[PDB]
């Protein structure tokens, strides 16, 4: 995030990090419950990719994180490569997540919920702080 702010460790329990076999963090994700994660369809996640939960400092060697394996990927078939519309993917874990203080789920809205423009929201992640 550009101009973002270092968060309080553990204050965003559903935020997960997705990493490939080579170990690179390429996308973020959100736990909607113990067995599922929601991310972007364009992240092109595979079952050899790993979901890391409960982490704060990726450069730490002492924090207790949960490296969860992925059982199956479900990319919204409506996703369009040309328009990037319907950019969503659901991940079913093999290694269920164990919820607690630092690892929790985020809520899902209903199809009819309306979030008015001007509403102050929040976004988190391990994206570049400058491009």
């Amino acid at each position: 995030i550009v101009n973002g702010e270092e968060a309080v460790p553990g204050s965003w329990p559903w935020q997960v990090s997705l990493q490939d076999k080579t170990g690179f963090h390429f996308c973020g994700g959100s736990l909607i419950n113990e067995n599922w994660v929601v991310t972007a369809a364009h992240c092109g996640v595979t079952t050899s990719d790993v979901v890391v939960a409960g982490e704060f400092d990726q450069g730490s060697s002492s924090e207790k994180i949960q490296k969860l394996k992925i059982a199956k990927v479900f990319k919204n078939s409506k996703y369009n490569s040309l328009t990037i519309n319907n950019d969503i993917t659901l991940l079913k874990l093999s290694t269920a997540a164990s919820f607690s203080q630092t690892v929790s789920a985020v809520c899902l809205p209903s199809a009819s919920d309306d979030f008015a423009a001007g509403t102050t929201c929040v976004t988190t992640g391990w994206g570049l702080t400058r491009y």
Partner: protein
């Protein structure tokens, strides 16, 4: 260069789709939602990430980082997958598995 190690957070306002078209024209579909253009922006590595807002006490996933300015411009808004337009698909998926 290299993705940051510590988790980052940022506050930002949502925009109506009509407003968003100001920056992205016809590339903004009904299944998307924009936020930002307020001195903050999502950058490489944040995609798939969450965009949460409060609804009676709880942070709800309103958006999922999707795409935006190629330079991570703080003067242009980022685009997100509008979860309300996708929750139906999500629900079906969780049931079929």
């Amino acid at each position: 260069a290299n993705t940051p190690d510590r988790l980052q957070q940022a506050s930002l306002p949502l925009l109506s789709n009509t407003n968003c078209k100001k920056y992205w024209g016809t590339k903004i579909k009904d299944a998307m939602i924009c936020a930002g253009a307020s001195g903050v922006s999502s950058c490489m590595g944040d995609s798939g990430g969450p965009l949460v807002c409060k609804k009676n006490g709880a942070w709800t996933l309103v958006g999922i980082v999707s795409w935006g300015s190629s330079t991570c411009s703080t003067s242009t808004p980022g685009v997100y997958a509008r979860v309300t337009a996708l929750v139906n698909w999500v629900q079906q998926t969780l049931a079929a598995n």
